[PDB]
C-alpha cells in the first residue's frame, strides 16, 4: 500500500480525557476538543513517514514496519520503539510506555493513541 500523501485529521474521539489526564482543564479542554491538525503519510518500504499537527506543535517521525525505530516526541525524547502493522490497516507502535495503533482504510487513517487507561482516536482522512 503506498498512497504517501497528506491526511487531514477529520473526526477524532475521546480529546478531553486524554487532554484532561493531561492536564487540561474542561475549560481548555472544550476549546481545544475539536482541533485536529494536518498529517502526512508517505511510506518507504517498511517505513513510513508520519508528519502529524497538534494544534500548533507539529511532530514529524519516520518508522520502519517489523523494525525498532525511534520515536520522537515534541519534548524531543526519542525512544526505540517496534512498529508494524495491527488494527489490520496500519500499524502499531509502542513507546514511553504508551501504544499507537494506527489503521489505514483506502483514503482514510483511524489513529487510535493509548495511554494506560486513556485511549485516544483520530481519523485523517486524504486531502
Excluded: W
Excluded at 472544550?30 to 517505513?47: N, Y
Amino acid at each position: 500500500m503506498n498512497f504517501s500523501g497528506k491526511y487531514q485529521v477529520q473526526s477524532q474521539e475521546n480529546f478531553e480525557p486524554f487532554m484532561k489526564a493531561m492536564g487540561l482543564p474542561e475549560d481548555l479542554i472544550q476549546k481545544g476538543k475539536d482541533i485536529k491538525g494536518v498529517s502526512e503519510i508517505v511510506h518507504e518500504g517498511k517505513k513510513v513517514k508520519l508528519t502529524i499537527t497538534y494544534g500548533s506543535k507539529v511532530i514529524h517521525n519516520e518508522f520502519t514496519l517489523g523494525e525498532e525505530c525511534e520515536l520522537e516526541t515534541m519534548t524531543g525524547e526519542k525512544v526505540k520503539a517496534v512498529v508494524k502493522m495491527e488494527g489490520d490497516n496500519k500499524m502499531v507502535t509502542t513507546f514511553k510506555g504508551i501504544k499507537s495503533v494506527t489503521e489505514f482504510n483506502g483514503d482514510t487513517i483511524t489513529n487510535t493513541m493509548t495511554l494506560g487507561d486513556i485511549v485516544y482516536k483520530r481519523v485523517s482522512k486524504r486531502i
